[PDB]
């Protein structure tokens, strides 16, 4: 996150660190006991399928302390329209071996139902982004959660207001854009996954994933997030599936 | 307005125009200035855009230069008060006033709805938790 | 659907529409309207007008910058088609009224003339606010007799020649604009 503050312990409850071989990972958003919505392109270069672990209650990365709970990634089911290496489909649901106890430091955001979210929740200007991530484009990541407060943009204002370069992705309707184009403060790398949380009459909802930029705080550029509300029925669906043999799973989408 | 005996005195804007209804020349006969005339005439052969009462819902019409204001009640709006703020009670106005969920019912009122974990309060638009670590709440700031 | 062009604000005494072109053919329009860090309200929902109320909206704080949208939406019920408004400060760009000359006393060889408050669509306390509640010293009526003469407040006190017969007529003005500096002159009323 750049320019962002850090999250005092326990604000940010639904966070979740994702590690594996117990080097840090990406971000990730508790939606229940159970379930972590994630991104995608987190797992491209993972070929450790058994060593990955979702860390609830964290804060401190240099510190342990009694209010972190890991837990075992039992599945990463991602869409199987996404294309690694790319943009679109950016996300992930992620079964934990076992579930974590809701306590004062671990409490899940509430993934909303479509039309609230598309009608009312994209209205909401301002949502909180959070992570670990690089405090700079190219720089060194965070020890302390960091969370930042960015104003969404509907995307034909998004193209608008961006500066033209060749070979960038597509904003497409699983997208939305949101952030500054001052150069002064955005989402970066490393924090892919975290979630992108909108509160709305006393109550918090999941409404992206941080996805993809065209680096960090760049003039010219807002951060491009997962537009959840597309994924509510495939996200529920799947939390009703039984469990399966092999940790990955693409899944058909829609 | 020419009625031959009434047409023995001098010039005078009460008799003429304010009386009865005067045409430009006779009112440049009396200001004989141009300008003067002009800001007169301006005014004076407007018009009262009020005369048709376009203020609908009990507003109240203002009249200006080929035009008009209307001042609405309460509970209502639009140029001529025409909208009812009471017919707008619907998911896409401000969630229908409901806390989480809105659901429409065409015909009928519309009604308010929770996430799992939340329940409806009395007045039918609040919701309120029934766990004890409900979604999307922050328990170290409660 | 085709995006809703020449997006316009028509205000006067704060009574704000918004209208906008074109005629719909197979298409309704539904208006969102913000501050630059507020969130987006919406206003005359799936309406076949090409235009929009937003004076409730923007009377809550008549010096905060509004921008308003047009959201274009295909006949039967994905982003929509929609166009942004030109911003807009209602107490720097509303226009001013019409005024109306209440009445005129010969107190002594001095004539006052009293101009009616102008009243605006701004409602404090149940009752409508003038545009001297909501503009203040911002405020200045001025006089075109028959020369010219300006006032603080509503009335004029001028000299008169006994027994001459006087013409007046008023206009409302806001000083420290530079564009809509003034309203369009009251109906001429002489003694
Ligand atoms: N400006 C931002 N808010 N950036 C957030 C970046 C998060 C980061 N995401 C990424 O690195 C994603 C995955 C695919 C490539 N990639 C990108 O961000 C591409 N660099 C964006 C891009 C490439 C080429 C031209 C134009 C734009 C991650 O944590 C894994
Ligand atoms: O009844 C509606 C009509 O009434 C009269 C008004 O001058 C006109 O502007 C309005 O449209
Ligand atoms: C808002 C309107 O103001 C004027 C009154 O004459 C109407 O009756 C109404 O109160
Ligand atoms: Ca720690
Ligand atoms: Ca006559
Ligand atoms: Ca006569
Ligand atoms: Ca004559
Ligand atoms: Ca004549
Ligand atoms: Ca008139
Ligand atoms: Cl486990
Ligand atoms: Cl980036
Ligand atoms: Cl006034
Ligand atoms: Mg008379
Ligand atoms: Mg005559
Ligand atoms: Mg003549
Ligand atoms: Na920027
Ligand atoms: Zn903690
Ligand atoms: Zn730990």
């Given at each position: ?54 860390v609830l209650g964290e804060h401190?990365?240099?510190?342990h302390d009694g209010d972190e709970q890991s ?184 | ?142 | ?191």
């Open positions: 996150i750049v320019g962002g503050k850090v999250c005092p312990k326990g604000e940010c409850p639904w966070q979740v660190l994702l590690l594996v071989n117990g080097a840090q990972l990406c971000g990730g958003t508790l939606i229940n006991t159970i379930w972590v919505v994630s991104a995608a392109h987190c797992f491209d270069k993972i070929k450790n399928w058994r060593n990955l672990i979702a401190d990365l240099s510190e837990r075992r990634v039992a599945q990463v089911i991602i869409p199987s329209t996404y294309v690694p290496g790319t943009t679109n489909h950016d996300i992930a649901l992620l079964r934990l071996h076992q579930p974590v106890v809701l306590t004062d430091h671990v409490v899940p955001l509430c993934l909303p139902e479509r039309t609230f979210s598309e009608r009312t929740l994209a209205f909401v200007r301002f949502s909180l982004v959070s992570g670990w991530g690089q405090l700079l484009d190219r720089g060194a990541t965070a020890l302390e959660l960091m969370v930042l407060n960015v104003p969404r943009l509907m995307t034909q204002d998004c193209l608008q207001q961006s500066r033209k370069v060749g070979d960038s992705p597509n904003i497409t309707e699983y997208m939305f854009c949101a952030g500054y184009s001052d150069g002064s403060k955005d989402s970066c790398k490393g924090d892919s996954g975290g979630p992108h949380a909108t509160h709305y009459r006393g109550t918090w909802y999941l409404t992206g994933i941080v996805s993809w930029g065209q680096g960090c705080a760049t003039v010219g550029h807002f951060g491009v997030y997962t537009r959840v509300s597309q994924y509510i029925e495939w996200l529920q669906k799947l939390m009703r599936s039984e469990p399966r043999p092999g940790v990955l799973l693409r899944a058909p989408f829609p | 307005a020419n009625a031959f005996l009434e047409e023995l005195r001098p010039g005078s804007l009460e008799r003429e125009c304010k009386e009865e209804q005067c045409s430009f020349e006779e009112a440049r006969e009396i200001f004989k200035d141009a300008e003067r005339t002009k800001l007169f005439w301006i005014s004076y052969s407007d018009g009262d855009q009020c005369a048709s009462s376009p203020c609908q819902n009990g507003g109240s019409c203002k009249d200006q230069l080929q035009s008009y204001i209307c001042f609405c009640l309460p509970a209502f709006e639009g140029r001529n008060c025409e909208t009812h703020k009471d017919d707008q009670l619907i998911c896409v106005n401000e969630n229908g006033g409901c806390e989480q969920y809105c659901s429409d019912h065409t015909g009928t009122k519309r009604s308010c709805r929770c996430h799992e974990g939340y329940s409806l309060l009395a007045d039918g638009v609040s919701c309120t938790p029934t766990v004890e670590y409900p979604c999307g709440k922050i328990p170290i700031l409660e | 659907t085709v995006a809703a062009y020449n997006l316009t604000w028509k205000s006067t005494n704060f009574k704000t529409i918004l209208e906008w072109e074109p005629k719909p053919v197979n298409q309704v329009y539904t208006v969102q309207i913000s501050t630059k860090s507020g969130d987006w309200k919406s206003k005359c929902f799936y309406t076949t007008d090409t235009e929009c109320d937003l004076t409730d909206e923007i009377v809550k704080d008549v010096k905060q910058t509004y921008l308003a949208r047009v959201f274009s939406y295909p006949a039967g019920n994905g982003e929509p088609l929609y166009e942004n408004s030109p911003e807009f400060t209602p107490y720097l760009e509303t226009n001013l009224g019409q005024p109306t000359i209440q009445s005129f006393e010969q107190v002594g060889t001095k004539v006052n003339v009293t101009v009616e408050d102008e009243r605006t669509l701004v409602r404090r306390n149940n009752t409508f606010l003038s545009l001297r509640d909501v503009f203040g010293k911002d405020l200045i009526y001025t006089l075109y007799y028959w020369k010219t003469a300006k006032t603080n407040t509503n009335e004029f006190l001028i000299d008169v020649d006994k027994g001459e017969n006087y013409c007046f007529s008023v206009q409302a003005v806001i000083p420290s604009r530079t564009v809509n500096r003034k309203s369009t002159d009251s109906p001429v009323e002489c003694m």
